[PDB]
Amino acid sequence: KVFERCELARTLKRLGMDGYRGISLANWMCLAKWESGYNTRATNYNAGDRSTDYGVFQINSRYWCNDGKTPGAVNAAHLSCSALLQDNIADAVAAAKRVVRDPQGIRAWVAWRNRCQNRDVRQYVQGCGV
């Protein structure tokens, strides 16, 4: 599923992401935007270390979800990576919350630092009613 901007914004708000661990909704939107283009079936293989990023938030198979083929991996969220490819993003949201529960916070995603951090992110939730 490819989400419409505002549709995703409301779904994340309903799921309790607004201000989760200090992270505003506009920030989670900026991340989803750059990580997947709001596409839940987005996958990206990292040839260099043999791990894969899954779903809307591009969750990594090394530490957060289990896909069986990733070397030196663990399951911190304890989910199957398959769960992060569903149209229903409840599990992907559960995983993303677990990731930011680590000291690095939203900074765990390098893309967030490159295109979101210290920028005007209002545009991601403007006109959405959230």
Swiss-Prot record:
Identify the residues that the record assigns to the C-type lysozyme domain, covering every copy.
1-130
List locations, semicolon-separated.
Secreted
* Plastid as UniProt keyword: no
EC main class here is: hydrolase
- Where primarily located? secreted
Instruction: Give me the disulphide-bonded residues.
Output: 6-128, 30-116, 65-81, 77-95
What PROSITE patterns does the database record attribute to this sequence? Answer: GLYCOSYL_HYDROL_F22_1, GLYCOSYL_HYDROL_F22_2
Enzyme Commission number(s) from the entry: 3.2.1.17
| Gene3D superfamilies hit by this protein | 1.10.530.10
Annotated keywords: Amyloid, Amyloidosis, Antimicrobial, Bacteriolytic enzyme, Disease variant, Disulfide bond, Glycosidase, Hydrolase, Secreted, Signal
Q: Which residues carry out catalysis?
A: 35, 53
Checking InterPro entries in the record gives: Glyco_hydro_22, Glyco_hydro_22_CS, Glyco_hydro_22_lys, Lysozyme-like_dom_sf
Instruction: Output the Gene Ontology cellular-component terms.
Output: azurophil granule lumen; extracellular exosome; extracellular region; extracellular space; specific granule lumen; tertiary granule lumen
Q: Which GO biological-process labels does this protein carry?
A: antimicrobial humoral response; defense response to bacterium; defense response to Gram-negative bacterium; defense response to Gram-positive bacterium; inflammatory response; killing of cells of another organism
Q: Which reaction does it catalyse?
A: Hydrolysis of (1->4)-beta-linkages between N-acetylmuramic acid and N-acetyl-D-glucosamine residues in a peptidoglycan and between N-acetyl-D-glucosamine residues in chitodextrins
* MF terms in GO: identical protein binding; lysozyme activity
Q: State whether it acts alone or in a complex, and with which partners, per the record.
A: Monomer.
Protein family? Belongs to the glycosyl hydrolase 22 family.
Additional observations = Lysozyme C is capable of both hydrolysis and transglycosylation; it also shows a slight esterase activity. It acts rapidly on both peptide-substituted and unsubstituted peptidoglycan, and slowly on chitin oligosaccharides.
Record's function text: Lysozymes have primarily a bacteriolytic function; those in tissues and body fluids are associated with the monocyte-macrophage system and enhance the activity of immunoagents.
Using the UniProt entry, name the condition the protein is associated with. Amyloidosis, hereditary systemic 5: A form of hereditary systemic amyloidosis, a disorder characterized by amyloid deposition in multiple tissues resulting in a wide clinical spectrum. AMYLD5 primarily affects the viscera, and the predominant clinical features are renal dysfunction of varying severity, and intra-abdominal bleeding. Inheritance is autosomal dominant.
Name of this chain's protein: Lysozyme C
Organism, scientific name: Homo sapiens (Human)
